[PDB]
């Protein structure tokens, strides 16, 4: 892992020492090479997970997130290349440094063995994200959005610090290899239920839950683009990974401390997909869809079954890819119209025939198209929820319907129909922003072809 | 001022605390505190304006009463035991009176109403001294008697300092008061743990000094005393935004910066002694302490404000003000978390 | 008013450099960024990674497990043994409490 993160660190010299006209190309190529070198830890010929040192490790859960975090950096990097092109070069290099820092910190999170390393990095990620949203966003509510995003997460995380301190003072190590082999069952006291809540209401803030998700649309709308990519793709998964790692030392409380959150996730998933169904801002449509999809993962982890964890990992990676793709697709029109409203441009597929295929495939991925790792995840967690209770499918089907509806409607009223003849500035396309969608969609096809990698602990 | 006077006054300020440390006699500790008191005033009052006169009067009148209360405690101890040292088996009333007087000396709430005013009424220097060099010897008194202290009101004073510092610094446009309320909150963090492993008090003190001194220098470099004055920094001194950002985000304890280390290990050593929920309250109000730092670095760094036409002369002319220790103190802060076991 | 510059009207690129690729304003940097991205993104990553991943042997012990299962059911059904007994640990090395 050290061989993966040290090159990511030396990418910062490669930014600040390279000339202004050879500072995107070199860093992008070398970031692709880091994404390549981050495929050796797929070499799992044996059931025993990979431990390189006391610091870092790698499991069938951590490794997909590692590879995706490495992959999304070039995409961030080229999507952030058409805007801030007339910006000063020091400002460019500062942006590149912020993204590389995010990459490094997130890989250090997913590879970590202790919970406090995970905590400090999980909470260190907030600084680059805040900077990206506030310094490079275009609107004026970016400040309130960064405030929301920062303080929701901190309010959630501080009880987690206290609970982890309690666990360290009880056990001694706070390391994950040992806390699985030594987990005495809990007395089911009010104090231990508070401990459960403290451990869980830092990730549930971030996944997010329907009671607390208002930080997510405010940030997605106003994160320039790459903030939306990361904040949809891996920063929500930073809560899923954390819940899966921490739920091992909390049995049997999860059998009854989970009911409110399973329930809130399901109902608020319907509510958020309904919000998606009737919405003016496209980058908020994607946001509420992200809430609706992460709620299923919350419910799945709360059920804590093998199929459920499997489908949760599948849906994690699939949603990350497809949501980053949708954000890039909407930015492709924002860079011409400079307006996020969807009804403005409502007659494309004349000028943009090829981009309208990426729209279609992304939507078919957003909804449950069967030969795809999205429907696999949704279907396995639905089977889990049915084994839990046979009445959850009543909710899941309503959401399936709504998720077909808002996706097809988005396609229709953004592409299909009469062209806006009053839009001369609808430039045809960029090879850059076609390669973005290609690099997003081809991994989905390949993971669907070989999904033995996209499972997790239980397979 | 003239050089002989400055030598005298600065030497007296150096010897106040240095007498207060190397002194077993509590009477000589009191002497050192009075030296600091007596010698700081000529420099609080060096500009000779009503704000400076009021600041110096408030400082003198607030510190003299605390000095007299500490002397009452010392005289009572001598009457009780015939010794000029706080042994064990003294009176809790004596020890608590001492602690309250020292709290009035530092600035801890509810004895905090004098520090923001005084720090507002004086230059950027002598706020630095007032917040760093004058906190040390009062802390030395507590450090030398940490087992004798009441765990109850020590923590009530701490918690009150945290709450009041956060809610004070939330709404201050003047920076000389924001730094004072930060001082109040940090002294709360110190004095909470002072009966528990007092080395962490000195840790938080050194961290707080290493943060505040660069900050006061940053304000010195353009005589900044307002949010709207530090907001005109992308035009005057635009290479300081990075360090100001990282040091404010250190003052508000965030993980990768070393300003989260004191809060973290303080909560650790409190959770070791079952001070769970008080620690939770302090940790949660530190976020309210962080909010105005976030607003501040928004105002100056991330959403660069309108400037003036006369600020272009500043661009023409040159500066010599950064003293080569700004960089060092700002880089030992913001970047020295992995050396935490070497710090503790 | 407060002396700010005006809203810069929208620029079209392809009027200049109709071979614009989306990357830079210099025609050479455009080319040498798209070439590098295509190369280092498809030609080596998406190809060699796919091959490297396709040729990982016994990913999480799948072929080995089926092979062991084949020989084990062979043994158990040749010897007429109970295939996949109902308890992983035998009670010969377990000690329960009384009452």
């Amino acid at each position: 892992m050290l061989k993966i993160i040290l090159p990511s660190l030396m990418l910062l010299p490669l930014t600040w020492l390279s000339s202004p006209k050879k500072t995107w190309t070199n860093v992008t190529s070398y970031s692709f090479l880091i994404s390549l070198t981050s495929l050796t830890l797929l070499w799992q010929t044996d059931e025993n997970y990979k431990n390189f040192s006391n610091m870092f490790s790698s499991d069938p859960l951590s490794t997909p997130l590692i590879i995706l975090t490495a992959w999304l950096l070039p995409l961030m990097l080229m999507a952030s290349q058409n805007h801030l092109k007339k910006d000063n070069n020091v400002l460019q290099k500062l942006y590149i440094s912020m993204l590389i820092s995010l990459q490094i910190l997130l890989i250090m999170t997913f590879s970590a063995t202790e919970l406090i390393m995970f905590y400090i990095l999980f909470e260190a990620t907030l600084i680059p994200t805040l900077i990206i949203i506030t310094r490079w966003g275009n609107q004026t509510e970016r400040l309130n959005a960064g405030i929301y995003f920062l303080f929701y997460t901190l309010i959630g995380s501080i009880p987690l610090l206290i609970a982890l301190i309690l666990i360290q003072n009880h056990v001694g190590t706070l390391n994950l290899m040992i806390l699985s082999f030594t987990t005495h069952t809990l007395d089911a006291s009010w104090s231990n239920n508070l401990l459960w809540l403290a451990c869980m209401m830092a990730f549930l803030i971030k996944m997010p839950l329907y009671g607390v998700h208002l930080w997510l649309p405010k940030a997605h709308v106003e994160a320039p683009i790459a903030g939306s990519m990361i904040l949809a793709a891996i920063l929500l998964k930073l809560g899923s990974y954390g819940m899966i790692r921490i739920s091992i030392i909390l049995d049997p409380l999860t059998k009854y401390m989970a009911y409110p959150f399973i329930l809130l996730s399901l109902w608020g998933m319907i509510m958020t997909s309904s919000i998606c169904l009737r919405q003016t801002d496209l980058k908020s449509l994607i946001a509420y869809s992200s809430v609706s999809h992460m709620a299923l993962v919350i419910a799945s982890i709360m059920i804590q079954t093998p199929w459920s964890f499997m489908g949760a990992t599948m849906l994690m990676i699939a949603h990350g890819l497809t949501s980053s793709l949708l954000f890039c697709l909407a930015n492709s029109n924002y860079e011409r119209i400079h307006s996020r409203t969807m009804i403005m441009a409502r007659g494309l597929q004349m000028v943009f025939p090829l981009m309208a295929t990426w729209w279609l495939m992304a939507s078919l991925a957003n909804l449950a198209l069967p030969p795809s790792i999205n429907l696999m995840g949704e279907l396995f967690i639905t089977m889990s929820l049915f084994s839990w209770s046979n009445f959850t499918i009543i909710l899941m089907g309503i959401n399936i319907i709504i998720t077909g509806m808002y996706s097809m409607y988005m396609i229709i009223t953004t592409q299909r129909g009469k062209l806006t003849n009053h839009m001369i500035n609808l430039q045809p396309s960029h090879t850059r922003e076609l390669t973005l969608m290609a690099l997003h969609m081809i991994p989905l096809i390949l993971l669907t072809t070989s999904p033995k990698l996209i499972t997790g602990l239980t397979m | 001022m003239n050089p002989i006077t400055l030598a005298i006054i600065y030497f007296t300020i150096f010897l106040g605390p240095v007498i207060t440390m190397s002194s077993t006699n509590l009477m000589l500790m009191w002497v050192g505190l009075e030296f600091s008191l007596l010698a700081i005033i000529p420099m609080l009052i060096n500009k000779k304006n009503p704000r400076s006169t009021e600041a110096a009067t408030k400082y003198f009148v607030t510190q003299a009463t605390a000095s007299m209360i500490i002397l009452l405690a010392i005289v009572l101890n001598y009457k009780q035991l015939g010794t000029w040292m706080f042994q064990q088996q003294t009176n809790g009333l004596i020890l608590n009176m001492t602690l309250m007087a020292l709290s009035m000396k530092l600035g801890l709430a509810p004895f905090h109403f004098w520090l923001p005013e005084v720090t507002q009424g004086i230059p950027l220097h002598m706020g630095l001294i007032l917040l760093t060099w004058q906190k040390i010897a009062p802390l030395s008194i507590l450090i030398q008697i940490y087992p004798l202290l009441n765990s109850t009101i020590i923590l009530m004073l701490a918690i009150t300092s945290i709450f009041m510092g956060a809610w004070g610094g939330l709404n201050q446009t003047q920076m000389r008061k924001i730094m004072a309320y930060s001082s109040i909150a940090h002294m709360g963090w110190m004095l909470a743990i002072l009966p528990y492993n007092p080395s962490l008090t000195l840790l938080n003190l050194m961290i707080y000094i290493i943060l505040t001194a660069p900050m006061f220098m940053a304000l010195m470099l353009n005589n900044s005393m307002t949010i709207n004055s530090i907001s005109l920094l992308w035009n005057k001194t635009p290479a300081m935004l990075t360090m100001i950002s990282l040091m404010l985000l250190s003052l508000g304890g965030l993980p990768p910066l070393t300003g989260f280390l004191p809060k973290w290990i303080i909560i650790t050593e409190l959770m070791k002694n079952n001070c769970l929920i008080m620690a939770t309250l302090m940790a949660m109000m530190a976020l309210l302490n962080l909010f105005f730092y976030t607003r501040l670095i928004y105002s100056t760094s991330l959403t660069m404000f309108p400037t003036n036409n006369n600020s272009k002369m500043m661009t023409h002319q040159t500066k010599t003000k950064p003293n080569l220790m700004f960089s060092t103190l700002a880089i030992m802060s913001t970047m020295t978390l992995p050396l935490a076991p070497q710090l503790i | 008013q407060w002396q700010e510059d005006p809203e810069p009207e929208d620029e079209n690129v392809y009027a200049k450099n109709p071979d614009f690729h989306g990357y830079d304003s210099d025609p050479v940097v455009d080319v040498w960024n798209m070439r590098a991205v295509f190369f280092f993104g498809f030609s080596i990553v998406l190809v060699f990674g796919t091959t490297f991943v396709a040729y990982v042997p016994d990913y999480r012990m799948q072929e080995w497990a089926r092979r062991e299962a084949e020989r084990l059911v062979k043994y158990r059904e040749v010897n007429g043994l109970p295939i996949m007994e109902s308890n992983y640990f035998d009670p010969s090395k377990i000690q329960l409490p009384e009452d």
Binding site: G137, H338 | N171, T173, S231, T303, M304, P306 | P8
Partner: peptide, 19 residues
Amino acid sequence: ARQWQPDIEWAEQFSGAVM
């Protein structure tokens, strides 16, 4: 169309001595 940076009605709300 352009990045929003503050204006006078934004900067003035930090000039009231109490906020």
